[PDB]
Amino acid sequence: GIGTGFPFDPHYVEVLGERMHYVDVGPRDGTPVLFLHGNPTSSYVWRNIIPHVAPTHRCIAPDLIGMGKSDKPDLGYFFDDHVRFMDAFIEALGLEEVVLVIHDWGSALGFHWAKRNPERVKGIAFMEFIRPIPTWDEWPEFARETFQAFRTTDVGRKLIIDQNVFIEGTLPMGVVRPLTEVEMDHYREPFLNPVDREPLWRFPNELPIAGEPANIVALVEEYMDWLHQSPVPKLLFWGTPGVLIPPAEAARLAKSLPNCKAVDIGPGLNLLQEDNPDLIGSEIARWLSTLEI
Ligand SMILES: CN(C)c1ccc2c(-c3cc(C(=O)NCCOCCOCCCCCNS(C)(=O)=O)ccc3C(=O)O)c3ccc(=[N+](C)C)cc-3oc2c1
């Protein structure tokens, strides 16, 4: 079955006075492949993808500040905080050119970094990514009242911070197949202490939905503008019914984005890596062999 283990040796780097944890496997030479997770996951979400790529390419998978095994400073964990730390992480490792593999809030980080540094990105593989959502009618109906509630400082903090609903409920509701107890405990581990759950609540409050928050809407529209023009090689994975990306949106993008291959993973919601890791990893490995890296 789908692997539940996390076999990777820990690596740490000090970034803006904080320790960040990252996976680092594969050959030392060549262009590295940088894997960026989102909310409410960690490098754990890549555990079954990376072994398809690590035979032939360096694989780097950081834990975002405040998540996974990375340090947990007392921040608001706005997107801007994550931008600052990830910019600094990339420079701290001395990375030059990279290929991005990104998901969920990792995709906003990766696309925003790529748009600002396009000479350094040799391809982007992405799935269930952050786009401006025009209206709440575009959010899945089965999750709509809850995500509206999440975006409040009263009910939303009760649910996410006090009661850990984003880990105990929203996360499994983002995977078609059932998560095992071992997998749930891996996703629970960074957040056993409620005071450490700020990123879990700030992230859905940063989602650009119906024009709010206006600043994130503008930032995400900017990198989407770039994505519609840039020749950067693109690999888009999508599933049915999806969450952030419905199938009809993936089909539009597969035609409108230049140099874009789109891959149907079958049933999927948000954590597509948990529903079809074999296809995602094997398609990434094949696609990499076609890039000038
Ligand atoms: C401890 N106590 C107070 C609760 C409270 C509520 C629940 C709930 C629950 C979830 C929800 C709920 O989370 N609805 C929302 C689902 O949305 C799914 C689609 O988006 C996946 C996105 C993934 C992350 C994207 N990240 S990003 C870009 O946003 O940063 C609503 C009501 C309930 C309910 O039951 O009352 C559980 C639901 C399922 C479950 N099982 C399958 C084991 C366990 C649940 O346990 C719960 C425990």
Author numbering: 3 to 295
Passage from the reporting paper:
The specific and covalent labeling of the protein HaloTag with fluorescent probes in living cells makes it a powerful tool for bioimaging. Here, we introduce exchangeable ligands for fluorescence labeling of HaloTag (xHTLs) that reversibly bind to HaloTag and that can be coupled to rhodamines of different colors.
Taking advantage of the crystal structure of HaloTag7 labeled with tetramethylrhodamine (TMR), we used computational screening to identify tentative xHTLs. In brief, putative xHTLs were designed by varying the terminal alkane chain length (C4–C7) as well as by replacing the chlorine atom with other functional groups. The binding mode of TMR-S5 and TMR-T5 to HaloTag7 was further studied through X-ray crystallography. While the S5 moiety occupies a similar position in both the docking experiment and the crystal structure (rmsd = 1.0 ± 0.3 Å on five atoms), the TMR shows a different position on the HaloTag7 surface in the docking experiment. The L209/I211 conformational change induced by the TMR-T5 binding in the HaloTag7 active site allows a more favorable orientation of the sulfonamide group to form hydrogen bonds with active side residues than observed for TMR-S5; while the TMR-S5 nitrogen-sulfonamide forms a 3.3 Å hydrogen bond with the catalytic D106 carboxylic acid moiety, the corresponding hydrogen bond in bound TMR-T5 is only 2.7 Å. This difference in binding interactions might contribute to the higher affinity of T5-based probes than those of S5-based probes. In contrast, SiR- S5 showed only a 2-fold fluorescence increase upon HaloTag7 binding.
